[PDB]
Design a protein around this ligand. Sequence first.
Ligand SMILES: NC(=O)[C@H]1CCCN(C(=O)C2(c3ccnn3C(F)(F)F)CC2)C1
Ligand SMILES: [Zn+2]
Length: 139
Amino acid sequence: SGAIYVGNYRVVNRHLATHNDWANLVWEDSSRDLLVSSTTAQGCDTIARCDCQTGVYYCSSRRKHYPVSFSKPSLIFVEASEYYPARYQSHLMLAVGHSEPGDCGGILRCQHGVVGIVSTGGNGLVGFADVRDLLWLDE
Ligand SMILES: NC(=O)[C@H]1CCCN(C(=O)C2(c3ccnn3C(F)(F)F)CC2)C1
Ligand SMILES: [Zn+2]
């Protein structure tokens, strides 16, 4: 689990969104595994606006932050699970790292701020849903 809290927005994995998230919906995109809801309180996270390919992510199944090299946001096949029909997830970045059910929502960050959240795992791979192109999160 986990979310990004920027301004009056809460960014979560679409597959983990709560009823309150759907009842206060700002934007959602199944192809990206992202959903954004509105918040009453202002958040403290800042979004990175860059093309970094190195950063650090939080892995809840290890209680650890790991430094990683990750690919550029791309259209990558994701295998079927309880949340999606095996398919093509867009704006996804891959790295070598631990990710097991329970880890989605962990933040990936670089020197500029938050880059994205854990969205995939397995195989010593971790996939991140990018948020750097969502410029409206800053206003
Ligand atoms: N974004 C996706 O399509 C996810 C949806 C869940 C399935 N996805 C996964 O990679 C797996 C999974 C199942 C439960 N949790 N996780 C994860 F992400 F933490 F690793 C490994 C099988 C793709
Ligand atoms: Zn950066």
